[PDB]
Every structure is written in C-alpha cells, then in structure tokens.
Structure 1
Amino acid sequence: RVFHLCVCDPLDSILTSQIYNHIEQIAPNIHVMFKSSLNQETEFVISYEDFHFTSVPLFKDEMVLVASKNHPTIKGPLLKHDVYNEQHAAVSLDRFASFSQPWYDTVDKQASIAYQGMAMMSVLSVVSQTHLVAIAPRWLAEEFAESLELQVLPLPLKQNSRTCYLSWHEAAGRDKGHQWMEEQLVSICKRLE
C-alpha cells in the first residue's frame, strides 16, 4: 500500500525523516510518499492549519528567535520593542499556510524583512550566513544550532507558539490501514512535545 502524506514547511524538516525512517524499519512493505506544499489524493496532512475533514491538535509548538552565533551585535535576549528593529529573514508571506506571515502581518513588521525564502531551511541557511534574524520553531533551531552555527533566543511576543494538527478525510478513517497510519503519525508527532 502507498500512503501520500503532506507535511508542511517547516514541520517536514524533522518529521519527514522521522516518519519515513520509522515506517521504513517496522513496515518495509508500506511505501510512504511526502509532499510539503499546500497548493490545492493525499491521505494525511501534518501542519499548523485546521481544515474543518478531521483535524486533531497534537501540541502547542514554542517559537523562538534565531541568529548566527557569529552575529556582531546580538548575544542575549531582546526586548519586544527591539524585535522588528533587526533585519529579518522569513518565508513568503502571501502564500496560503505561510509559516511566517502571522509575525509580519502589518506594514511596520513587514518592513523589517530583507529576505523572503521558499522554506524555513532556506531562511535558516541565510540567517547562518548573515546578520539577519528569523522566527522558527524551537525544535528546528535546536536541530540545526550546531551544524548551521545558530544561537537561540526567546521570542518576546505574546504570539510565541503554533498548534500542530494532524488532518485527514473523515470518510477515509473507516479503513484498517488508515487507522494504523493515523495511530503511527500521532505517536511520532507527539514526540515533539
């Protein structure tokens, strides 16, 4: 059997490997395929989005600020009033399911952006090479803090979290294999807290 999963950016940058490697080990007969984009079929969606379709909130995901470890002027925590006086890297704001848009929804916040990339790993790579800052999930910053030489800081905003949801087509749940995968995906996702 083939399962088509959509794991949206940035969640795909840790969950895709975890899901793929696990299912590869315990069920080599099962073939899982992944897409990250939300343009429009697809058995399961893992995202920060609610589809109203069955949607299950899995956890509240803490967000943080990231910058290069080698930044010449950022070291310790920032004040809320100072967040948007830095230069920011973010993912494309205008697209559906944009990870970054909730933190740059006004003109003054958007003016701080110097780079809009396609995915959060592109954002992190640019941050690692520049003086730009970005807002990212804590698990993502920590996963790449050592390899990409990033420092992590608290996000001093009231909107410092995002809820991760597992979603599927309600009618499809009435199937043994669909239920097995649902259970598997809940376990793997919840390990992110």
Structure 2
Amino acid sequence: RVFHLCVCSPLDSILTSQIYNHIEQIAPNIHVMFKSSLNYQETEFVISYEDFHFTSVPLFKDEMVLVASKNHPTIKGPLLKHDVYNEQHAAVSLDRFASFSQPWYDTVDKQASIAYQGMAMMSVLSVVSQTHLVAIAPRWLAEEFAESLELQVLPLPLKQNSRTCYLSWHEAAGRDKGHQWMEEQLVSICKR
C-alpha cells in the first residue's frame, strides 16, 4: 500500500526521516511518499504548522526564536520587541502558499525589513550564517544547526512566539485498518 504524506517545511527536516525510517523498519511492504508543501485523499496525511481546513489533531507547540550570526556586529543578546524589525531579515518566500514565515511579515513595515527571501528555512539559516541578517526559526531547527552554522539563538520578543503542529487526514469514509494503523503511528511518532 502507498501513503502520500505532506510534512510541511520546515518540519520535514525532523519528522520526515523519523516517519520514513520507522515505517521502513516495521512495515517494509508499505510505501510512504513524502512532499513538503501542500498544492488520493484516503491515502493522505498532512503534518504542518497550519490547519488547512479532513480532521485536525494538535500534537505539540514549538517555540520560535530569533537567529543571527554568532559574530553579529551589533546583536549580542536578546532584543526588545521594537528592535526586531529594525534589523535586516531573511525569510521564506512570502508568495508561497502557507509560507512558514508569513505570520511575522504581514504588514508593509515588517515586509520592508526583508533583504532576502529563500525557498526554505534551511536555506535561510545558511544565509543568516554568512551575513548580518536575522531570521525567525523554530528553536529545534536553530539549535540543531547553531554549532555548524555558527548561530546565536535568542528568545523571540514578539507575541507570536510559538507555532502549533497539527496532524490532519481524510475522515473515515468507511472502515480502514491500514489507514487507522497509520493514524496511530503518526500520532505516536510526532508525540515522541
């Protein structure tokens, strides 16, 4: 059987491998296919920081942080809320449907702070590493790459300092043991 999973970026950088590897081990017969952005229903599961409006299960909340180069010329510790958009920002392309960065660049003034739009947070962190730009990232992602990319990881002094991870699937249009098995697996893997 084939399952088509959408694990929306940037969550594909932690959860896709966990899911792929676990199903590879316990059900080598089952073929899981992964995409990392949205856009056959009964084979579909979405894991995302959005609810796309299918079911919707909130799994966990992730802290979001501010990242900058370790050797930033002026940033040497936490910022005030008013300071944030006086920095130059790197973000994920705002034109992308459900872009990760959208919540924090929803006014002209905030958008004006952006000097670079990349295709994924992983690209964003590479540019932050190499420049004086700042970015807003999940703590887990920033902390994974802080050592190799020489990043400082700071609290985000904005009201929107978390995102909620949701698991979503097509409501049972009939009984389906394999589908229910995958529902249970994905909750377990995500909650772990």
Work out whether the TM-score is over 0.5: yes
Cα deviation, residue 41, structure 1: 7.3
Give the total of aligned pairs.
191
Structure 1 92/42 Cα, relative in aligned 2: closer, same or farther at 3 Å?
farther
Confirm or deny: 8 A CA contact 2:93 2:117 kept in the other structure.
yes
Cα deviation, residue 70, structure 1: 2.3
Cα deviation, residue 49, structure 1: 1.6
Structure 1 173/157 Cα, relative in aligned 2: closer, same or farther at 3 Å?
farther
Q: CA RMSD in A?
A: 1.7
For structure 2, the residue ranges without an aligned partner over 5 or more in a row are none
Write out per-residue CA displacement over residues 3-39 of structure 1, whole angstroms, 9 at most, x where no aligned residue. 1100111111111111111212222222211001222
For structure 1, the residue ranges without an aligned partner over 5 or more in a row are none
Match of 1:4 in 2: 4
Amino-acid identity (%): 99
Write out per-residue CA displacement over residues 27-83 of structure 1, whole angstroms, 9 at most, x where no aligned residue. 222221100122297510000121331111111221001111222222211111100
Alignment of structure 1 residues 1-193 onto 2, 5 Å: 1-39=1-39, 43-171=44-172, 174-191=175-192
Confirm or deny: 8 A CA contact 1:7 1:46 kept in the other structure.
yes
Confirm or deny: 8 A CA contact 2:42 2:170 kept in the other structure.
no
Structure 1 16/114 Cα, relative in aligned 2: closer, same or farther at 3 Å?
same
Confirm or deny: 8 A CA contact 1:10 1:121 kept in the other structure.
yes
Cα deviation, residue 190, structure 1: 1.6
Confirm or deny: 8 A CA contact 1:6 1:42 kept in the other structure.
no
Matched residue of 1:162: which SS? strand
Structure 1 170/95 Cα, relative in aligned 2: closer, same or farther at 3 Å?
same
Confirm or deny: 8 A CA contact 1:54 1:170 kept in the other structure.
yes
For structure 1, which segment, 31-40 or 148-157, has the greater mean C-alpha deviation from structure 2 after superposition?
31-40
For structure 1, which segment, 22-31 or 161-170, has the greater mean C-alpha deviation from structure 2 after superposition?
22-31
For structure 1, which segment, 80-89 or 31-40, has the greater mean C-alpha deviation from structure 2 after superposition?
31-40
